[PDB]
Symmetry: C2
Subunit: 713 residues, 2 copies
């Protein structure tokens, strides 16, 4: 209507301008976007009243420049916990809240489309961007993304789900050919995106850098048209990842509508200006105006609903304080208690000896486009000060001076920050600290970021020798006295845990909780927060145990391809099916209280499976319980994983003795497996497994499918 109005007005060249970004703003010869720091803008066409639309990162919060040249004003953003921590909440409602808060900020700073959430599968722990992805499971990931997208888009701005698809490693991501069976695609990698597209209707999708089965995703017609549109019914537009692909017209033919960020010749001497090349292809009949029209329409159908289109006056002053409370809540529910041998929460009196250089160099989140620049970021130490806990002040001063000393030293100064030695304390000095203090609290920290994969080496997936030395020594001397030790994992992805976990009494997976980290952590120690998070990803006993062994491809040092040999058997699907025991299993997490499951009733009417059960707080402290419903399908015709997560739920805050009724519905189509051509729901007996984790099944029931069901996409 209005869209088809503008379309009939546009000249050929205006249509071309519209499908290409204006170049990376503020860099190279490029002018800052009106929202300095923004990832990109579209070409304005003042004529027909088209404004430049603004795109900005990212998954951990709006990423824009805090300050602006010749400006007295401020533009700070809320830095939320990382996605893997958000996912650990297993809380849709909360994700929706996080989306609304980010959404308000996005709107009020004049941004039209937020580049989030990222929702690639956790194929392998070493992936540099796992921290900004949700899960190794498509249901958990898809559900979380949907909730986040509904939140963002309740605010009049756009969400962009990414990266479509199978961007599961950073190594050579812009060239690597990802070889994946159609079955693994549909069951694992596309599956999350399918859920998000159908349940939340994101304004836009960002095509991945990598090739899929021979074709760049930004140039893959099967992916962007056949799957995305013709099967799933996507009605937004697709944009390319930044500088992705190698042919602009092939991108438009495949259904990649918006090429970003534009002016690719600025980072690759080989690329042509994308507008020149497209104009040429229309001129030569390599590209038809009809195809160009469909691209422009896809973009316009969406962006006429953007605030920019309606000249919306933004305040440049969102409610930061209100949002910080949301970020704190998000983190509070996302901390995972991994181990507690009568160690947590800490007694009121408890005098804490705080170890680990990361108590001060607290990691708020990984680097890259998923980074953020908040007005502040509370470290673990500062959090403990603020809460006025009983910490060893002499030790804290010792660390403060140690860090500053070596950060100024040639071998350990920023360029990225080199990893500092952790065993600088005398064996005797720790003996004294053990006599003086009540408990020990050890922070071990890890950081990753876009563009770099982790390696299965010490200081990375494994503890460095100095870290294991520190833990062994602190453990021994604090255990010498009748005292407890606690480790805080300030990490973005699984690390080795088996070799040292038996040495310590408590283990909090604090991940990377954004600006409010220290505050969240302090409140978890004291029991003010009752941990309710659970793993969205499997912690392997050793790196050699992970099924995605081909990571990061062949040849290892410069991978040109990587094939998913493990296929659908990725994450817990692998460990359950082939009987490999994880260090900590998918969906595992402890509580400061106990829960009891009961009253299971499963019913299937041929179109809907209904699982009902009661969860009662059986302990002495209020808490939330995440419950998980796995379906074990019969063996029947084709091979299937041991079980598959089909639904989940997080109870309200239950006081002791309180209980809740849990009612979950699963459509029969979600019980299907893909056989290469069709989705099939095989007839036979199915098991319902309601768990507190994938291996802690509290309730079991069966139901039967009488007639097989088939679905050809």
């Amino acid at each position: 209507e209005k869209v088809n109005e503008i379309l009939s007005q546009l000249t050929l060249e205006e249509k071309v301008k519209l499908v290409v970004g204006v170049g990376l703003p503020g860099l190279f010869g490029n002018p800052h976007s009106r929202v300095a720091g923004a990832a990109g803008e579209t070409h304005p066409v003042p004529r027909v009243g088209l404004p430049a639309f603004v795109l900005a990162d990212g998954p951990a919060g709006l990423r824009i420049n805090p300050t602006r040249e010749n400006d007295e004003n401020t533009y700070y953003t809320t830095a939320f916990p990382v996605e893997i921590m958000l996912a650990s909440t297993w809380n849709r409602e909360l994700l929706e809240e996080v989306g609304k808060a980010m959404g308000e900020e996005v709107r009020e700073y004049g941004v039209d489309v937020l580049l989030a959430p990222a929702m690639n599968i956790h194929r392998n722990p070493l992936c540099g961007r796992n921290f900004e992805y949700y899960s190794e499971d498509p249901v958990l990931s898809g559900e979380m993304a949907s909730s986040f997208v509904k939140g963002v888009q309740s605010q009049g701005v756009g969400a962009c789900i990414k990266h479509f698809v199978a961007n599961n490693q950073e190594t050579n991501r812009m060239v690597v050919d990802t070889i994946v069976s159609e079955r693994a695609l549909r069951e694992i990698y596309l599956r999350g995106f399918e859920i998000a597209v159908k349940k939340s209707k994101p304004w836009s999708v960002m095509s991945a850098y990598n090739k899929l089965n021979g074709k760049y995703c930004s140039q893959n017609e099967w992916l962007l048209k056949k799957v995305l549109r013709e099967e799933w019914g996507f009605e937004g537009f697709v944009m390319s990842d930044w500088y992705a692909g190698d042919n602009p017209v092939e991108q438009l033919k495949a259904g990649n509508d918006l090429i970003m960020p534009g002016k690719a010749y600025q980072v690759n001497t080989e690329r042509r200006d994308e507008i020149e090349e497209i104009m040429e292809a229309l001129k030569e009949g390599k590209l038809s105006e009809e195809v160009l029209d469909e691209c422009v329409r896809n973009i316009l159908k969406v962006l006429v609903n953007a605030p920019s289109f309606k000249n919306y006056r933004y305040s440049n002053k969102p409610d930061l304080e209100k949002h910080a409370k949301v970020a704190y809540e998000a983190g509070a529910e996302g901390v995972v208690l991994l181990r507690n041998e009568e160690a947590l929460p800490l007694s009121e009196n408890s005098k804490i000896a705080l170890f680990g250089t990361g108590q001060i160099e607290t990691i708020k989140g990984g680097t890259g486009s998923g980074d953020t620049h908040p007005r502040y970021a509370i470290s673990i130490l500062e959090g403990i000060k603020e809460r006025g806990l009983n910490f060893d002040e002499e030790l804290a001063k010792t660390y403060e001076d140690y860090i500053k000393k070596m950060r100024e030293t040639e071998e350990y100064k920023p360029r990225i920050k080199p990893k500092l030695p952790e065993n600088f304390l005398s064996e005797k000095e720790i003996h004294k600290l053990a006599k003086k203090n009540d408990v020990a609290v050890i922070v071990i920290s890890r950081i990753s970021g876009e563009g770099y994969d982790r390696k299965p080496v010490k200081g990375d997936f494994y503890l460095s020798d100095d870290e294991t030395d520190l833990i062994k020594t602190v453990s021994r001397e604090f255990h010498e006295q009748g005292k407890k030790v606690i480790v805080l994992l300030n990490i973005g992805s699984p690390v080795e845990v088996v070799s040292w976990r038996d040495l310590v009494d408590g283990i909090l997976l604090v991940w990377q909780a954004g600006q409010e980290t220290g505050r969240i952590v302090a409140d978890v120690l004291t029991g003010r927060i009752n941990p309710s998070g659970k793993l969205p990803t499997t912690f392997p006993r050793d790196y050699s145990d992970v099924p995605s062994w081909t990571f990061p491809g062949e040849p290892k040092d410069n991978p040109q391809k990587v094939v998913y040999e493990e296929d659908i058997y990725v994450g817990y699907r692998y460990y359950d099916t082939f009987g490999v025991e994880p260090a900590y299993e998918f969906g595992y997490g402890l509580s400061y209280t106990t829960f009891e499951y009961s009253d299971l009733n499963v019913s299937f009417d041929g179109e809907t499976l209904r699982v009902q059960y009661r969860i009662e707080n059986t302990g002495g402290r209020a808490g939330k319980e995440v419950s998980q419903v796995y379906i074990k399908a019969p063996k029947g015709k084709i091979d299937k994983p041991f079980q598959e997560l089909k639904a989940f739920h997080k109870t309200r805050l239950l006081n002791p003795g309180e209980s809740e009724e849990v009612v979950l519905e699963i459509p029969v189509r979600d019980l299907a497996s893909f056989n290469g051509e069709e989705w099939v729901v095989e007839a036979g007996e199915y098991e319902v497994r309601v768990g507190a984790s994938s291996r802690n099944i509290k309730l079991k029931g069966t139901f039967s499918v009488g007639e097989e069901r088939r679905f050809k996409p």
Copy 2:
């Protein structure tokens, strides 16, 4: 014709008698079969000139009573190497020879049908009968069985392939419900039987004890009629395993023609006489005479070709000496050299210190119906004496007296023989032996048998403490002097190998080689035989590494079901696909010489794949080379193993510098995967991997399938 002649003559009750055995001969009230020791006989019907047909075990050689009461004559049989060792030859031609030798014996002792070969898949190393099965791979197993069956049946007698199907554990085999996807069935478990049925046309098939997906195999119409007959075109008859199933008429309705051994009421107070029950069902219209007719016809169509039918006068005097040479050959090519750090073969002079109680208590094969009673069985020690090798005579006397001493002791006398302590030698006594001798040779022995599964415990899958003590001590002191140590594995199935293999210099997998064992072993040490065997099964680093973790079912102590969670990913299919490293991989084996592969040419004409390559003996001793061709199919639509064995070959005896041309053809239908409904050969690029083992690939080529191909059975 003749069959349909007799059929029209038979009375109703004669037809019934014919489909039931006459009871277990020589046991309970039962008379010995005319061939005493035979497993069973059919009912004679002198009227229409029908004789009692004789059935006898077994896979390791004809099993009958050597002596007969009131008889001056002898009836000894050749005891061949066990099937897992036969399979290790990877030699079809040789298997055919073994079949002919067994076949002649079977004929001349008045037996009509030999109950062999057994060809169940090696799902799990712990299975008690793995020793009498070929492989974890269906191509290797099916090819070996086919070659054996052609051999047996060139002699005018019948072969019986068993056990159909998925009899992969002994625990509760007569009741356990085996839960297997149709895909795993068709790709792994049925697949071997399919090959044997189509390539060799066995006279008969023996249905397994266990249930398959809810139905006893002897009562499973899908298996015995739909798969066996309607799809595969089987034209023999099916007999039940001994006392299998629980309903005689259900057995006949399913396509199980001959019920064996008859008189099931003799071992199970609950069963009725099968003739009574069948007569009753015909009487009541539970069973139609038409179905009975088809059973009797199936039996008769086959057995009118049996020697008994034509009153064949057998000599009761086969050529034992000629066959013993075949048994020696079989074993010679079936020994697997696993490790050789410049230790083998032994120098002419070498003075051998022989350790291990199994040097005298040499295991010729496992127990059960697969057992045999040969006129003699050469132990490892006796073999070394006979060959006149330079062994420590003082030590041999020490062992001889030790064994006899404790075999007479209460704790270690037969009832089965309790496992004897192996570390009875002083640390000092071994020091002296190390000074006196040139090399050490350590025999470690294992035995299993029908009806008992092995456990992943010391003394079984793992070395007992005394065995590892012995090896550690002998290794240390012989290595103290500049001397070598060798271990001989006289086992029927994989054992743990990683913990101790680095301590020793050589390792010969001698399996269990039947009556000629000692002779074969001696000739391998001296280099008279150049080892050419290769593993038909994977040796796991540890038992926890094996994918068939559900073995032996739920509940563990009294399993009522066992589901194949690992599905098609069994054996090397699992280890390759999910990157778990074996101790020794499928198809691995060393040689006293070296070989070089070359001149690869692969061509595909759309119906046949052709792989050609040259193998040259590049070393200093004559030898044979087993080569293996694995196909790695593209990922395409459905998940597939990393690679799959599709063909193999064993070269002639090549002298140094000699070479051979290898030409192998693979029908396009063998490139297929089963998707639950149809066999599919997906289009795309395929890799040819010609290996000296599954992980030692010497040649690679690609070919392409242009158009997909489909086959609905």
